């Protein structure tokens, strides 16, 4: 209707922000940013709902406007800034560090990380082309272009990004024998290393994946994003380890064993 939509209601926003139906009509529309609208998570949502630091929007703004907190080690003062997958949220509150990584149920958990891990992040290369004056370049899932890459780095691979500098510290190739995370959709927040790839002419390369318990499954390659070598993940994984328990194991562990 005659241009961009600036407002956004509750309900229209995704289920994995854990937005309660009541206590408001509207939701925070994520601002135009690196990540997409539906996949990403606003900073306000990360603060008041998850971490429980702020109560109101006021308080959130008052926290953000005094610098302190920063995504990618950069000021980032806007309220509804889209913090997406695999982002370092550096805070000065008792030297606390946070990595956004997916959970069992496809949400963003409060997963703390070490001060050494805060240095670097990862990124799935979406295209690699020549820019102006024949200079090749890559582009990650979060738009962080890197000039003068290694010729080994082709499409669908992962890059380790240094944050402090826009550089390629490492790269990992796309095949079996590597630890392989999976985002997007039904099998969102799982790990199973790849068994084998499938070509399919005319788009959509369904990859076959096999977790630690050998409960194999298939997902689409656009939502697949690797991580590291077998038994050597370059990022510290959360509780659950990208396995996904059935409802039986849930009723055994999460409402029987854990009780006092």
């Amino acid at each position: 209707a005659r241009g961009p939509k600036k407002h956004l209601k509750r309900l229209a926003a995704p289920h994995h922000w854990l937005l309660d139906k009541l206590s408001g009509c509207y939701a925070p529309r994520p601002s135009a940013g690196p990540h997409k609208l539906r996949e990403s998570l606003p900073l306000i949502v990360f603060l008041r709902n998850r971490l429980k630091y702020a109560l109101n929007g006021r308080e959130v703004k008052a926290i953000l406007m005094q610098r302190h907190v920063k995504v990618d080690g950069k000021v980032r003062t806007d309220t509804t800034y889209p913090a997406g997958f695999m982002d370092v949220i550096t805070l000065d509150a008792t030297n606390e560090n946070f990595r956004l990584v997916y959970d069992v149920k496809g949400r963003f958990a409060v997963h703390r990380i070490t001060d050494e891990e805060a240095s670097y992040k990862l990124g799935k290369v979406k295209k690699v082309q020549l820019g102006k004056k024949g200079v090749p370049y890559v582009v990650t899932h979060d738009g962080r272009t890197i000039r003068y890459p290694d010729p080994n780095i082709k499409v669908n691979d992962t890059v380790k990004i240094d944050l402090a500098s826009g550089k390629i510290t490492d790269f990992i190739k796309f095949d079996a024998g590597k630890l392989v995370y999976v985002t997007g959709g039904r099998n969102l927040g799982r790990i199973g290393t790849i068994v084998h790839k499938e070509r399919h002419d005319g788009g959509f390369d369904l990859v076959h994946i096999k977790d630690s318990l050998d409960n194999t499954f298939v997902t689409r390659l656009n939502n697949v994003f690797v991580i590291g070598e077998q038994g050597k993940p370059y990022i510290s994984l959360p509780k659950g380890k990208g396995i996904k328990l059935s409802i039986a194991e849930e009723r055994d562990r999460r409402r029987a064993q854990q009780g006092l």
Partner: protein, 185 residues
């Protein structure tokens, strides 16, 4: 406008309203347990109905099925924690059987009478609806409740109001002060 607060009615009326068999039998329950309306009975039979149809839907599928197991165990365990179904028949086929009498037994109106102290069920209801009695620290004022098994031994008079302790009341204030003490000028 925001999202709606959802709602759905708990009572479910019968098909044939004037029937000699149903009207005579259902009113006995109402007289024994001390239920004010037929609406309460219908509510209880509606919850029971839902449980029944759920059980039937569980049973149409095969044994050793993920859907049938989980849901069965939770349904059965729900019916156990409330105390309607005892420990002997924890089989899922037995929850289909059941009866309305057990449900009314498990209501807090009559559990005060089944303990004792309240003499009549009607008197017990009065006690409950007049802010007396309590499950533990938490006070309850509603005849219908469903006592959750563990709660049974903790049922007694509340700290506020008499029997438990505290002040006497209004009538006793008037007898002690306005009548007994007020004789001497």
């Amino acid at each position: 406008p925001r999202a709606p607060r959802t709602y759905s009615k708990t009572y479910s009326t019968p098909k044939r309203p004037y029937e000699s068999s149903r009207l005579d039998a259902e009113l006995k329950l109402a007289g024994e347990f001390g239920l004010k309306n037929k609406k309460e009975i219908y509510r209880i039979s509606f919850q029971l109905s839902k449980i029944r149809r759920a059980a039937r839907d569980l049973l149409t599928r095969d044994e050793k099925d993920p859907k049938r197991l989980f849901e069965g165990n939770a349904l059965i365990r729900r019916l156990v924690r409330v105390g309607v179904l005892s420990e002997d028949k924890k089989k899922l086929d037995y929850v289909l059987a059941l009866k309305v009498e057990d449900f009314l037994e498990r209501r807090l109106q009559t559990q005060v009478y089944k303990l004792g102290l309240a003499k009549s069920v009607h008197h017990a209801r009065v006690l409950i609806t007049q802010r007396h009695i309590a499950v533990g620290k938490q006070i309850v004022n509603i005849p219908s409740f469903m006592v959750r098994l563990d709660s049974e031994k903790h049922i007694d008079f509340a700290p506020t109001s008499p029997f438990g302790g505290a002040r006497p009341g209004r009538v006793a204030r008037r007898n002690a002060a306005r009548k007994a003490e007020a004789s001497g000028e």
